[PDB]
Design a protein around this ligand. Sequence first.
Ligand SMILES: CC(=O)NCc1ccccc1-n1c(C)nnc1C
Length: 206
Amino acid sequence: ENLYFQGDLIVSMRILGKKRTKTWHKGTLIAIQTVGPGKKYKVKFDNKGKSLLSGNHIAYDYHPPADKLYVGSRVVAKYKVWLYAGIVAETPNVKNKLRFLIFFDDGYASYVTQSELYPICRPLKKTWEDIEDISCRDFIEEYVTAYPNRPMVLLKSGQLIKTEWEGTWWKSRVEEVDGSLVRILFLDDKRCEWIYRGSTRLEPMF
Ligand SMILES: CC(=O)NCc1ccccc1-n1c(C)nnc1C
């Protein structure tokens, strides 16, 4: 059946849609289709294209209030400017300077503000089940379900550690700590990465 209304969605509303590049883009909802118990959403993008999308691949074109976001919430966030999907890992508190921690689907971790987030319209019941990479999906499942139990390593600037990258352990130095993230300098290539302090990639004991 073709619908005009579905929950709080209405044909002709402004929306974000996921493209095949995995980046998200502004568009208009032009149709809502039911296929059995399933639903699909047709989006005409502002520049290029039409797509027929599942409800976990569209997002509202506004910023969610803080009270609607939980650990595990499925969101689209500004990525450094692209829009990319992720999962809320922390909500604002004193220890993170009132920011949201986002774990992006590709494994990137960043603190963002509410103005950098868009809520996904119809997330999966287990929100991590549409993460493509099984290693990434399993980490997120474990993190979200164990929360607020979060084993982390206490690191300090200047500390020498080994950090995993592409299957091997590299000599590295802690440059800076920002809440639950640590900025690691790899000593061989002298390049930095922000890493979650509960990552098994971090080995201070060697
Ligand atoms: C940069 C970061 O720590 N992201 C968290 C994360 C989120 C999802 C999947 C993997 C990871 N991860 C990476 C990448 N390194 N360790 C872990 C855990």
